[PDB]
Amino acid sequence: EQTYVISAPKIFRVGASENIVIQVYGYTEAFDATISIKSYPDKKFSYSSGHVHLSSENKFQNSAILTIQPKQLPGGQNPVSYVYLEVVSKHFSKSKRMPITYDNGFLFIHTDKPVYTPDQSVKVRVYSLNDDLKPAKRETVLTFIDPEGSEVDMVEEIDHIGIISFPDFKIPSNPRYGMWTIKAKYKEDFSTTGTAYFEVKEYVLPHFSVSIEPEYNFIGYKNFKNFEITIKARYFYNKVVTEADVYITFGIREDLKDDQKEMMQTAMQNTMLINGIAQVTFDSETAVKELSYYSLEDLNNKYLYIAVTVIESTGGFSEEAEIPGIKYVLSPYKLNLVATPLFLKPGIPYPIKVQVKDSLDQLVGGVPVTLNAQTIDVNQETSDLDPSKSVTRVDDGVASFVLNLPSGVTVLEFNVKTDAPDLPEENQAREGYRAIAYSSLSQSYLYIDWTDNHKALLVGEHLNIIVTPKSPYIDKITHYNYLILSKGKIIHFGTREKFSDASYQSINIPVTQNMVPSSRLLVYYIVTGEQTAELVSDSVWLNIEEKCGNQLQVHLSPDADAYSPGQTVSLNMATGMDSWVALAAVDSAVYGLERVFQFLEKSDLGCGAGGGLNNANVFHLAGLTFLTNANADDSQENDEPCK
Amino acid sequence: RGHTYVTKNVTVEDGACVYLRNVIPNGETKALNNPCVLSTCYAADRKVNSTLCPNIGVDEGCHVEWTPDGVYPNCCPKHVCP
Amino acid sequence: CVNATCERKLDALGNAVITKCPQGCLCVVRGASNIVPANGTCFQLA
Amino acid sequence: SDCTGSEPVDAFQAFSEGKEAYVLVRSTDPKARDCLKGEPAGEKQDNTLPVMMTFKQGTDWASTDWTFTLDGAKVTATLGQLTQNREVVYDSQSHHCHVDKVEKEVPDYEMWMLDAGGLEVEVECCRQKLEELASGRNQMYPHLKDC
Amino acid sequence: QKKIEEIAAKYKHSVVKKCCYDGACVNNDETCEQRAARISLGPRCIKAFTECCVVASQLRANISHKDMQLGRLHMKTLLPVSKPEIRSYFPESWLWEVHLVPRRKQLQFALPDSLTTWEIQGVGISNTGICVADTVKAKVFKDVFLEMNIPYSVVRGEQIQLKGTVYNYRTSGMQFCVKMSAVEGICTSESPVIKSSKCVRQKVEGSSSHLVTFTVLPLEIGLHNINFSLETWFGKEILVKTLRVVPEGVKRESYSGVTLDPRGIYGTISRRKEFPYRIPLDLVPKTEIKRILSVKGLLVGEILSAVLSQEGINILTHLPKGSAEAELMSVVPVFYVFHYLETGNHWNIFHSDPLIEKQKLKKKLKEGMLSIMSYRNADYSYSVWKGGSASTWLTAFALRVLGQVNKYVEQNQNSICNSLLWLVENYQLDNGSFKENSQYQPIKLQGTLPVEARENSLYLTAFTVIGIRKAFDICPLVKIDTALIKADNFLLENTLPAQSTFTLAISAYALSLGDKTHPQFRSIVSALKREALVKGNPPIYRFWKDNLQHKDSSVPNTGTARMVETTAYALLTSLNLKDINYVNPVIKWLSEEQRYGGGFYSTQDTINAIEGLTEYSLLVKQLRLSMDIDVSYKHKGALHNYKMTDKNFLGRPVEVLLNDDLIVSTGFGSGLATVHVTTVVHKTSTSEEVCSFYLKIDTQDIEAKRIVACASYKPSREESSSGSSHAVMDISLPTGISANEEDLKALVEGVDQLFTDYQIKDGHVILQLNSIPSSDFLCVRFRIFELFEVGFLSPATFTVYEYHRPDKQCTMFYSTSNIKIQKVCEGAACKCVEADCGQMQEELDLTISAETRKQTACKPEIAYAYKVSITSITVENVFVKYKATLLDIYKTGEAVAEKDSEITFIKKVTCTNAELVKGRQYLIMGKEALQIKYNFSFRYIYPLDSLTWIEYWPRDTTCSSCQAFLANLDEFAEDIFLNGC
Ligand SMILES: *[C@@H]1O[C@H](CO)[C@@H](O[C@H]2O[C@H](CO)[C@@H](O)[C@H](O)[C@H]2NC(C)=O)[C@H](O)[C@H]1NC(C)=O
């Protein structure tokens, strides 16, 4: 049998270099194939095409960097939402209806301060990066949207280096208070958008400063009955207020997004402020007895909106201060899964690596974890496995499990629960799940996993991934494969020969710079035989330490725990290569906060940490399409590939 | 430790029991590799008593190594703890 | 020009763009400037 | 509208009861002082009135006081020994401009108007009446002399 | 309590939820029925308000304060939603710069002076990806540092206490002594040593503060430098502070303008013009009459100079902010500068690039176009007061301003469409007129109550037709063109016969903006050309007054804000008809009515007169500008030669220092230059002005001080009783007094609001209003609290004026201290008090050698020397004025005072040993005097300050010891004059 596999990102990106891969098997003679993107549905216009040469020296694999030019598309009423990826050769020819999206690139608006007062200038700059994460150099448009929703500005500034500094925005002297909105956007042919927010609040000179400092930021199992609040009030930086009357109002809250609040007129207690510090205790249980909430089991994920009004005695002044919310936490721990595909390979040890987190999202250790397992076979004869106990290693927060299953298993309904030394049964954290089996028309499966879990693979190292097949016909598997996605681009490919004397094989993968900070590694082979060949694929997710190509580093010279006003100080910037550097220096008081890598990851079209229902689904989850004379299914349903 | 699971309507031929392409005699408890179990069959009612490797719960200072080479119990996930 | 029913529409890209009436009329989309889409009205020019 | 106004003439009412300043705009006297301006400089005593007439000569802002005595449509202005008999021959309907006639062997006609400014049509009627009475004699413009 | 929760429960989700809340606010001064008269939010809100108010007021009787405050809590949290406002102000972020790093780059800067904790964030954008570098902090602070609170200004004579505080950040206390740099003009308690007050070493506990006080007494006017040296064991920090000293009394600003036309295109050659130096009557002693000069080249010179600088807002500075019309006087000057420079292509006026200046102008113009977006409602209407109801007047005005700017800054055609439709669909009756949604009274028109309705409807129709005809080229629908046909038909049918020249001029304008051929519009423009006034024949000036002829005949002596509105409307009606033969005097008047800075009396005459001046300057050919304007005093030297040309055509101001007459002159040249002088006197009393409001203001003491200031409109002839137009109650606060802003908020914020805006800027309290009633008073009460102790408090003013007629005003002096009479200062701590006053000699002293009388009389510095007799004492609560007659003249260096004539003496009330008794005779000698023009002749005033010699001289002879005294007096009297040593 002679097989061929084409792998292209699931979504072709207008204006991006959509790398396509072609891997053919069985053919021994050198030959040429021209991968081509063609219009829809008549294939009349060739948006682009590429030439590959497939030889024994080339291992019969090659990549053709295609590119849909932005101007080559119609406009107005009907710009194409579908293109035909098409391959030609003297042997085969295949085509598949592929989607295209214009959302290419990223725009990060960066306003210096997040809160402005009337008549301050809004310093706004925009970074423009294309899908390759390189300076875009395209003409951008801002649009300051007032709190009511009407555009009050629009200003275009051409890019030259990727950092597009804009003319400052002057907040009027009588502005419209609320949460304004900036909307950077590309001017031509790209649907890329960027958004930032900044509040415009009127400055009100305060009689004095009232500061609230709660005991903890969360109300767990213990402090649900008593909650010490430290309410300090002071004049202008070290003039202690003498005596004041402190009125406190407490109310339960739903969500920090909408400012709805429900008051509790049963505990609007007030006290006497004495010499600058007055501390009260809030009994959450008896206070919430309005509607009574019937337990600590309720009120979970809710906030305790604290309102404090300090009215001092001497001058008759009044001042108010609040805490926006104190989240109720039902359990001092949170569980989640790491490096576990929610898809089962019948006949393979299913490793479950649960990870325990505090309410601060910090990896706690030494927490015993118990895990039960309810299974559903093909005969629906549900079988229950014994509870296993694993305790979290303090090095990474991962408490490893290995849950072997019989061959006939399809749906494993396993449930992890914390078993803390000091917590009652109710106050423990529990998480259920549901692992489905790899659906294969044959009895062929694949399972791959790399060296260890407690290091978070670092760039520059080498990856020793251990690919283990499990199937009949195992002694006819000739070639493996591996495709290493990143940001939606197929940045690698190859083939490793299988040693027909060994069951598994250690694939050696060189970690490069393109793979930062998250990449997927798809691996598969070809089970062949009677009237059909079969792809059998299993993917993983490689989380790499967030490192730059150009690591930036700023120092202040001289360095000390304190400087003096007007002092002349030097800023020392050192990079890896020739690189522009934007700068900013804001008062640290506005922050009581720029996170790009979370916004810069919306380009990874994948979902989950690997695995899949069937073969085609292991691809469609990793963000690849595929053309193959073997099994091909699982059409787009482009809306919501995975969340 | 290792739980058990019993299948029904197993292919029994010539008094021998072949299951998942593993031929096992009637009164023979043979260690297998694919899958990795310790199995025994009965052609009288066409059922197979089979036990798995015990599920591993990893405590402090331990880790799991598993290679599919060899038959039970060497094909089992071993609770390797230095 | 009694029935052309201009409206505020999203582009094929995402910019809110008010459709155009026939050659001798003008589109006026009542209500706030952010409600999109919203069916407008066509008035004459003379 | 017609502008036969303020009949009969009253040299007091035609002077806005001695409360507003008047300037000289037209005169057939070729010795017409430049920027001549006579305002009431006191109160109305028994048939007399002080008027501090400020005018210009070259660059000097001279100020020569006078005394105005009123009898119906006639007036006698005297400073020291110099004597002039003027008679208000026509007076605007609202006392904004009036045309003065000084008496001598050749009668010269002067025309005064409020300093604060007079209604435009009444000033046009004063000018027409004057030009009629002056009868083609050449007029100076005492307010068009760099005031 | 239970009767509070019933309210908090009944109205939680209601539609009118703010209504009864602000009806539940505490107001111990007015009934819930009296407040309900001020609601304009309909019968639902008035009912919720009345009910919630009565059920809140009934409870507050016989209640403990804890329950009252808990109830105010219940209200302020349950009923409202939230509040956007921050209690801290965050400094401006610096270092906002992009820096290409050639693999290493060290740059240096200077940390700002504040005490913050900066955070520097580097974001390296390279071809390999973005890199949010680690934030490097920088905490700036001084561990021990003094900070003072110097008052904004200080009325000269008052004894300030410059409060201060030394802050300590180290936990271990230390020693420190503060010392002030005693400037010669600033009289302090101690005296300089070599120049610093004695500093006693005090101790402040660690991690705390310590109060510091300083008592000064300014005696000279002008910004005085004052230092504070914190002398500690670790350094000496010198903190510079500037203490502005303001003269006493109220400020009065009187202008005078002249157009220099040396060639004679204005129908009169004018080369020399004399600005006389007139000393007003009631003036503060020891004060100069400041009078800036400013000579600008073009006709639009003042507007250009205002815009083409960092001032840009000088067109309003005398009027307050807050209404939307302020944010349109912000963008009318810049727009008209732009329209002049563009539609004339006079960009080469700059020596700079014609591109950078155009860009800066467009930036200011856009930044202005947005300041009004804050006052737009949900239905695209504009509202005068932010948050108030929608107004037909200000929607039309904002449409005019936005439809004019659309020529240079493309405005959002859909928003203008929506606003025009909001106007012509809701607010146009069956006859054609427009009605006002709000109760904003923009102008007060005369006439009986039905005739005032006619005139007001006519003014509003014409104003809105102007606004629509200006913004109608953005959104040229047919619905609003039919609306304009209807409204122009209303004007054409219902303007004549007129009832005031103002509405006739605005109707002639609003009709000229459209079809200029309707035979009725010819009649309107003809009946407007007839109301004209003129100064001269052929007219040198031409203007229009705010009243008709057959209703009033008196011509005003000065310019009023309706005179310039009517003149500008008639000038624009002419320019729209291209009557350039006819507007050359109108432009002369309007260009002299201008005020140094660019603007005119109010905000309406400003926009209309600037439009007239510019639409004219563009319509008549530019004449070459070349003059040598030579300003010089009469009996002094040359002030400053002005070489006028397009190179420098905006000669900066020149403070006219010397106190002589001023004379501006020019040689033979080409151009049209205007010379504005601005006299700024400080009057002592305000009885000599026609004031149109009834004012009374008190400082009532509160038990559980509180200024109670009221006002009332005095309707003039042939007016109605509907009260004033938009008024502005300006309540200056005495030194060291500060209004309690929460009371003002409680006045403006509620739905029962009395005052529609407020603001406390630089020690003023500028409340605004929609009207002040003529039937009865209108009292504002707001608590004040002494911010620091000041002695010898001088009364501060309380002005109320209209906003579109700043001449309909009234001023009143008031002090917050009823402290008793100042017969004596009682000993020590007085050397600063009497430092600059006159000291009477002891009664009937015989130790006098009679030789000091010889030598003091013949000094060239002493001007006058003669004896008088006081006739009466009269006080104007700032100074006292002594009416006296001249008995015997003995010496006079300056012009002489007639024998037995009345001379007025003046001295400060806060001067003790210089008392005068009515009727008694005294011998007086002192320094120079002032010549004041009392409308008929000269008059002399003489201050009684230091170096003024005064002795008591009894008339009788029964002293038994003053026989030799009077002997020396009479021999010196007979020998002083015949020799003159
Ligand atoms: C107050 O302090 C300033 C310095 O901060 C003094 O400064 C002026 O004169 C000094 C020379 O003696 C110069 O060194 C300063 O630069 C100069 N400062 C300024 C702003 O001009 C100043 O003399 C002190 N005030 C008085 C009245 O002496």
Residue numbers in the entry:
A (entry chain B): 20 to 611, 620 to 670
B (entry chain E): 5 to 86
C (entry chain D): 14 to 59
D (entry chain C): 22 to 168
E (entry chain A): 680 to 873, 879 to 1388, 1400 to 1676
List sentences from the manuscript.
The 3 pathways all converge at the activating cleavage of C3 into C3a and C3b, and the subsequent activating cleavage of C5 into C5a and C5b. C3b and its inactivated form iC3b function as opsonins for phagocytes, while C5b initiates the terminal pathway by assembly of the pore-forming membrane attack complex (MAC, C5b-C9). To address the need for a more detailed understanding of the mechanisms of C5 activation, we have identified and characterized a family of C5 inhibitors from tick saliva, hereafter named the CirpT (complement inhibitor from Rhipicephalus pulchellus of the terminal pathway) family. Analysis of the specific binding interactions between C5 and CirpT1 suggests that the CirpT family functions by direct steric blocking of the docking of C5 onto the C5-convertase, and our data thus provide support for previous models of C5 activation, which include convertase binding through C5 domains MG4, MG5, and MG7.
